[PDB]
Ligand binder design. Structure first.
Ligand SMILES: *[C@@H]1O[C@H](CO)[C@@H](O[C@@H]2O[C@H](CO)[C@@H](O)[C@H](O)[C@H]2NC(C)=O)[C@H](O)[C@H]1NC(C)=O
Ligand SMILES: *[C@@H]1O[C@H](CO)[C@@H](O[C@@H]2O[C@H](CO)[C@@H](O)[C@H](O)[C@H]2NC(C)=O)[C@H](O)[C@H]1NC(C)=O
Ligand SMILES: *[C@@H]1O[C@H](CO)[C@@H](O[C@@H]2O[C@H](CO)[C@@H](O)[C@H](O)[C@H]2NC(C)=O)[C@H](O)[C@H]1NC(C)=O
Lengths: 75, 493, 75, 75, 75, 98, 98, 49, 49
């Protein structure tokens, strides 16, 4: 199938090594990091969006981190 | 040597009066001088070489040890003496060991012991200061004539030797008149307070007072057959073992440790006669006598053809390679920069007189275009070749880039950078004076501070300023902290 | 892999239809919907997180949408 | 030894890259990090010393950072 | 470099004299003294920093000593 | 080292900025982290030249300060050690008690 | 009695077979075929290229220069198996001999 | 790819993870970053494949 | 720049003549001739008033 839906969330797990665990553990975070480096303006845009919606620092931080995790991943 | 695309070319334009401009020449990068009705020149300091070097002190790095001796005394009898302590060749240390009837001593206790061993250094490092009046600054001066082969060609130019004996040199350019160089070889890098050690076929430029503070045994550096090493205890190590006997061994070759200790010290060429790269000179350009080549020629009546695609230099400047298909070989190249949607002559040439010399020969025309889309016309009439170009960026971009470039120039050069491109000026001189005072005060404070420690102290100063109620002290701390952060982030170029 | 970083959003738009425009327009939304449909309990979890981190209704709905968007795409 | 006194911070700065600029720029930071990660126990002692000498948080942080930097470097 | 991380402070302590115990006991102190006497200007800067951060004399002295030790050693 | 051995704590020899090998007595070794010795100078940002940093013997000798030395002549003989022998003197008689 | 070599750092190094590949500024990173060779050590740098350097487009271009590496001398760390030791306790009799 | 070609942003092309070489029409080239098309898996802890 | 040697007269034109002068604390060019054949010495005297 398409790589967009890997078989990582199913509850089935065991002692043995899963297929491509080493790469797939950090593949998504590597993609997010490289997207963030490639397009740094959206960091400013997400900062603005979090600052104009988050009253508390917890709210602002969670909105900023979720927004910086969605855009590289939802692309 | 007509550098284009070097990325550090540092355009300098304008003349104060009596037709001269003050410029500072550095090894990395050129200067491009383009005055009105004068040929443009891409000048730089090519290399500085010291003709004769005087060896001042020679440390050594490896060491061989021979002729180990040892004398001992019973505990109460005092210090032990070898006759060879007074010999400057041998290196040795007194230790206390236990003696008894098994060691031949009649009285139990701890007895003195000294073990002296010969010392000679297999390899040495040979620091050799440079006499400040045997230098030779070689300034290479191109003519920027628009030839076919000189676009970035590093072997074409005019060579002028600048020495403290004869600083003012008139470099006769071919068919362009004699440029006047009034230089200042005595104020570059302060070679008096530098030692220029040589290691082995790898020399370096080191500040004077550090080479005097290297924990290695030195010599006089008198080219003597048998040297007298001082502080030989730094290499040889004396192990007392279990406080029953003393054994001496050499610590080994200090080559790697010295190579590490030379970090942050600019390297230097030592092949053949020494040639000091990584230097700066303050030649002042007097362009009284610079004429143009083709001011007497006519205008070309025929079309042009592009032979290589136009490209943009890192500084926003385009380069044009055209070939003139016409019979009147000595001529001028008409060149008008038509702006976008308007015929405003907003772009200007960086080649003073674009001239075709021969029918077969190609010509390189350099021109700075406007920051927008801008066509460029190279010919006369309706059959004129029209180059279309889209230089990207904004004038604010050039302003920011120039500000950062000037800040870097002030970082490496210091007060001398105020004299770069400084056409006379009276406010500029006052700025240079106040910068001299503040730079001396800062250099006294922040001498010997690291890459990271400078940034740390800058952050601390900024934090102190932000939390200082005293407005004057707060402003001073913030201002000095910002520039300290900059210097920490630009230091060790 | 390479499929996780699609060529979407790069400023090369033209009048001509791009490669797999019709499918790639909605592949991401289809993935999110199918993940949110095969794992209903995370809807409850995200509702709880949004309720206990979102002071206002707009903040609550923003947090809930971002949580239901990031997790299917972080799989 | 000789390596303990690098030729850094002196007044001779030019355009050309210095000898081992890139390598020698981060050697101190790297050795401090290696010592800190190899002796994690000293971190809590440094925190203790900083906390019982720093009246304000800024003084606490300054003393803690200075203790973290000095002890591996005096090693 | 290698010399920047001496084998000192480790848990292996015995009766026999270690390699270059006598020489290596005071090398750090000697280099700090040489740097301090060769850069006397930094002394007043360290005093300034200590005085505007140390509320009490003990904190002033601690910060001044730490700054005096760290900067040559980070060199 | 070379004819001069030392006793070093395990986790420090794994933290020496020198290029290692597997130590498999192989004819052709595969050095890892070779960038520690060779230094790459970009000069004036127009060309790159590579040179060796030199013999690390003196720097390593310095880095071994505080590490107890050891004999390596012939078969290795570890001095500077301690043992916890417990002495059972049940069977010790005297010479001249008779 | 017997020592097992566990890791062998090296101290000196000789360098040979220096190579170099360059690319025009926009064209990206330069590659030598010898990067994948574990024998060679090398680093990528950015240099300026132009019509004098043979490149058609001005700017800063990538550059990688890979050179061979071998260590002339090495240091040879070798752990000791804790059950091949030999503690030699020497016990005198304190008999009052001469 | 085979008989099909596309216009792709150059930075994106350089970013996409696949083993690559100089493209100098040389048979049997050397592929930098060739670990992306191989996966090594442990059969529990006994062996390597 | 002052001139310590009060009157630098060449006595014989065969014997070379030496002059002691006190330059200014800045960089200074010293001229020992009348025309463009004038020998020009530039000295940088490090120090402060
Ligand atoms: C130092 O040691 C060397 C050798 O270790 C001694 O050299 C001896 O020299 C004499 C004549 O000069 C020879 O007959 C011996 O055979 C040499 N010894 C050897 C080769 O082992 C030297 O005498 C010693 N003392 C001095 C002051 O150099
Ligand atoms: C740099 O300039 C030199 C001299 O102007 C060029 O050398 C000339 O090259 C052309 C053809 O390439 C020959 O016809 C001439 O005879 C050469 N003149 C000499 C050697 O004096 C050189 O080609 C230019 N470019 C470079 C990259 O060096
Ligand atoms: C590395 O450099 C060496 C020498 O610098 C090259 O050795 C050459 O080897 C061939 C045959 O193997 C001889 O014909 C040449 O005369 C040698 N060159 C010399 C002696 O300068 C070697 O080919 C280079 N490349 C590799 C991969 O080792």
């Amino acid at each position: 199938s398409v790589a967009l839906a890997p078989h990582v969330g199913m509850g089935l797990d065991t002692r043995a090594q899963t297929w491509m665990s080493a790469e797939g553990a950090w593949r998504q975070i590597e993609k997010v990091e490289t997207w963030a480096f490639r397009h740094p303006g959206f960091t400013i845009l997400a900062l603005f969006l979090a600052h104009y919606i988050g009253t508390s620092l917890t709210q602002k931080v969670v909105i900023f981190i979720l927004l910086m995790l969605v855009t590289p991943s939802m692309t | 040597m007509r550098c284009v695309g070097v990325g550090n070319r540092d355009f300098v334009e304008g003349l104060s009066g009596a037709t001269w401009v003050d410029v500072v020449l550095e090894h990395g990068g050129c200067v491009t001088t383009m005055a009105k009705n004068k040929p443009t020149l891409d000048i730089e300091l090519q290399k500085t070489e010291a003709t004769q070097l005087a060896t001042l002190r020679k440390l050594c790095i490896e060491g061989k040890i021979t002729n180990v001796t040892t004398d001992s005394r019973c505990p109460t009898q005092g210090e032990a003496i070898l006759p060879e302590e007074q010999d400057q060749n041998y290196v040795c240390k007194h230790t206390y060991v236990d003696r008894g009837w098994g060691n031949g001593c009649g009285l139990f206790g701890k007895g003195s012991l000294v073990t002296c061993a010969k010392f000679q250094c297999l390899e040495l490092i040979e620091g050799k200061v440079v006499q400040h009046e045997n230098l030779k600054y070689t300034v290479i001066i191109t003519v920027h004539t628009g030839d076919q082969h000189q676009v970035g060609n590093e072997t074409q130019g005019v060579t002028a030797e600048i020495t403290p004996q004869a600083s003012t040199v008139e470099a006769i350019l071919p068919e362009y008149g004699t440029l006047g160089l009034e230089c200042s070889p005595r104020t570059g890098l302060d070679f008096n307070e530098m030692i220029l050690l040589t290691m082995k076929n790898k020399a370096w430029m080191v500040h004077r007072q550090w080479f005097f503070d290297l924990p290695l045994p030195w010599t006089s550096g008198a080219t003597t057959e048998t040297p007298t090493w001082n502080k030989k205890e730094l290499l040889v190590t004396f192990k007392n073992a279990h406080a029953k006997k003393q054994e001496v061994v050499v610590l080994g070759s200090q080559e790697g440790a010295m190579h590490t200790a030379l970090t942050g010290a600019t390297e230097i060429q030592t092949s053949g006669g020494t040639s000091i790269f990584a230097g700066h000179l303050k030649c002042r350009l007097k362009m009284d006598k610079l004429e143009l080549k083709g001011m007497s020629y006519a205008m070309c009546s025929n079309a042009f053809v592009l032979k290589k695609e136009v490209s943009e230099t890192q500084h926003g400047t385009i380069l044009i390679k055209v070939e003139y298909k016409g019979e009147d070989a000595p001529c001028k190249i008409p060149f008008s920069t038509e702006d976008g949607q308007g015929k405003a002559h907003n772009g200007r040439l960086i080649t003073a007189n674009p001239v075709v010399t021969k029918k077969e020969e190609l010509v390189n025309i350099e021109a700075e275009p406007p920051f927008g889309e801008s066509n460029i016309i190279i010919g006369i009439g309706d059959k004129a070749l029209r180059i279309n170009w889209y230089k990207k960026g904004s004038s604010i971009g050039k302003m920011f880039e120039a500000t950062a470039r000037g800040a870097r120039r002030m970082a490496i050069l210091g007060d001398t950078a105020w004299d770069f491109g400084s056409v006379g000026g009276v406010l500029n001189s006052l700025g240079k004076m106040v910068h001299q005072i503040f730079g001396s005060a800062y250099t006294a404070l922040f001498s010997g501070v690291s890459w990271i420690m400078k940034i740390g102290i800058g952050v601390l100063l900024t934090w102190i300023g932000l939390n200082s109620k005293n407005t004057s002290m707060s402003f001073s701390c913030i201002v000095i902290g910002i520039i300290t952060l900059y210097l920490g982030a630009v230091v060790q170029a």
